[PDB]
Structures are given as C-alpha cells and as structure tokens.
Amino acid sequence: MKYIQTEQQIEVPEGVTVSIKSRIVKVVGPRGTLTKNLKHIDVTFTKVNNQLIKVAVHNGGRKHVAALRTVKSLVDNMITGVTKGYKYKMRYVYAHFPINVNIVEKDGAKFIEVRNFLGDKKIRNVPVRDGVTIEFSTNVKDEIVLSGNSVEDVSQNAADLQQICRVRNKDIRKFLDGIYVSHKGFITEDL
Template sequence: MSTSQLEKFQDEVEIPDGVTITLNKHMLSFVGPLGKTHKNFRSIPVNIEITDGKVLLKAIGDRKKDYAILHTARSIIRNICEGLIDGYTIKMKVVYAHFPITVKVEGKKILIENFQGERAARITHIVGNTKVIPKGEDVILTGEVWTDITQTAANIELKTKVKNKDHRVFLDGVYAFEKKKGLEK
C-alpha cells in the first residue's frame, strides 16, 4: 500500500473548546458545559489516541469496511462533542382521531395512555440521560447524546404503531416532526 492509501485509514477529530475527553482503555469519557457522558468503543475496531486537542483514529485493517467503521467512530465522537456544547431536541406530535392519547413520564418510563381506547397504558423506556417533557399535544425530547434521544423517540413511535388495522386509515400515534440542534426549554 502506498502512503496516501495508508493516510486514508486514519482520521482526527478536533476537540472543541469547553469539552474535555479522557481515554481509559476502550472507554471515552466526555465532559462539557451541558454535562458529562461516556462511550464504549470496545466493539468498534478502531485505535484511539488523544494528543494536544485532537482525537486520532486509526483503522485496524485496510479494507473498505474498516474505512467505513473509522468514519462511523469519527461521527460518534463529533456528535457527542456537539451535543455537550449545544444539545439536541426532537419534537413529537400526539395524533388521534377519537380516543384522546395522553403521554406521562414516571421516572425512566414513558406511559402512553388511552391509545385506541386501551385500558392498560403502553410503557416504553427512556434511553440514557434524555429528558422527556409532555406539553399538551407535543412531546419534547432533549439531551446531549444524539443516539440516546433518537432511540427514545423511536421507542415511543414503535409503541404507538397500529397493528391489525389499515395504517392509512388509523393514523393514531406519536410522531416526530422536528429534529434540531440546541435545547428547547
């Protein structure tokens, strides 16, 4: 392999001001203005080093798959750094035709009550450090880690999926309608 091809299999991420990153074996710990979090890179085959304000990433192999994994790791680190500075917000809308759906939060659980007239509440869990705020017909999810917020939103949508009926007619559910950078109050 030529040196230009080898350079292709390494990348670096600038650490923004206000964010500190520490490496302990495969665990990266992030501390920023909005809080702190950590990410385990044990299952991601990438060599990680931290030197003078940069995170250096090197792929283990030299195949196309290793190149893709390298850039996935870069995106994960970049998104966590941006989230610790700005935060992320997802807005979801509660939609119903006949039975009014209510969304409540109890600890780390989200209760979706009266979905299609059901007596028992549908229960889903909050992932990570995500804050869920029900406001009337809207549900606002905020936090620092993008993957945790989107997984929580996906859990809510999946719990309100209509089964055994025509989904073009029965449109009840909780749906994401806005995703943005920055915290919503």
C-alpha cells in the same frame, strides 16, 4: 489494496475535554459527560492538538476503513450532545380517541404512560432512558420533547414511543393515530 494509513479528524471545541485510554472515550463539556466503549473497533487515536484529535487505522481493508468514519461521527455526536445537546420533539395526533400521555413514577423509575390509544383500555408503558428528559410543551398542544446529552438514548426512547403506539390490524391510510417524531434538533440553538 490495503491503505497504508487512513485517518479522520475529530475536532474538539473550546469547552470540551475528551479522555481516551484503551479505546474507552470519555467526553466532558458544559452539558455533562458521556462515555462510550469502542473496544470492538481496532482503531488508534492521537492527540495532535488540544483542539484536534486524529483517529487512524493502519493497514486496513475496505470493511475496516468503514469503521473510521463511524468512530469519528460517534465521537462527534458525543461532542455535540455535550455542548449543544440533542432535542427530539414528538407530536402525537389522533382522530377520535384523545391520547393521554403522562409521566409517572412506577417503582422508583420514570415512565411515559400512553393511555387511550384508539380507545385501548391497555396502558402502554415506555421506560425513560437515563439522561433523557421528557418534557411536555404547553405552547403547542399535544407535543412531547425529549432531550439529553446522548443522541443514541434520546433517539431510541423517542422511537420507543413511536413504536409503542403502532396501529395494528387497521388500514394505516385511514387510521393516522400515533406518536410521531416531528423535529430532531439541538437544545442550543444557537451556539
């Protein structure tokens, strides 16, 4: 059965202004601005209020209504990134060879450079995505902090470190080394 009209509600906080024309969403707030292209989803937005926005699909199937909650949650993640901000904390651990993770400017761009992973002479370069800040906590030894307005970028770059240090041809029950996401959070904490 085709639902006549199914809706989801994107609640905008006090400091955020979102602009949506032709399913291109711009979200602006205290921590910066985000933009996403939603032109692949046939979905309809509506400003019911300055603090609420209604997203709706008319005459949709079971696969098409599966994309309303995705769109609503993507806009919600935008809003939380532009107010609270996303902060992924990764901890790298090692048994014998100490991993040396530094930040280097290679060719006008920014790179995480992982060295000595299990004694590899290979240098592993992970490009820093734009808007992601790579910071090294001093209070805790051997921990990387990624932060940004976009959960997608921060999580992708964190997973890029997670995968650049994958242990190959070893028993991963005994070889525990690598860079692991420890904690996914918000920059603020608490508002």
